[PDB]
Copies of this chain bind each other. A is one copy, B any other.
């Protein structure tokens, strides 16, 4: 009935965060949390494929993409399962994460349990950029902090 998850974001830099997930029945995944130590503005936020922290955030691999689609924003029909768009930090360096998404899940084929949340150096262009990179990573740049998505009480 009710699934819950948690992710502790850590990096080599000063970006830290806690993300909570909750999914009631087949209702959407409600995502809520904070990230701190960010530069002011938009930062890409995606579920990456692998919950593998052997190489910091590098070993998380690419956006979770079981449908083998191109990169989008959450509202796009053409998106990675893992494409959760951008979070906005204010001048205090804090983003409030508040996302509702029905493509991700906490169970079944699309479950993100044991995958990695990543927050990025730069704005995700939502796949609307001109170059090839936009269709891949939305040009969100480097990985500031990541964590493995765990089952929570």
Interface residue ranges, A against B (CB under 8 Å): 5-6, 8, 18, 49-54, 61, 113-116, 147-153
Contacts and interface: CB of A to CB of B under 8 A. Distances in A.
Number of identical monomers bound together in the oligomeric complex: 2
A50 B150 contact: yes
Q: Is the interface of A mostly helix, strand, loop or mixed?
A: loop
A44 to B, nearest CB: 20
A149 B114 contact: yes
A131 to B, nearest CB: 26
A8 B114 CA distance: 13
Contact of A53 (B51, B54, B115, B147): B147
A18 B147 contact: no
Nearest to A60: B150
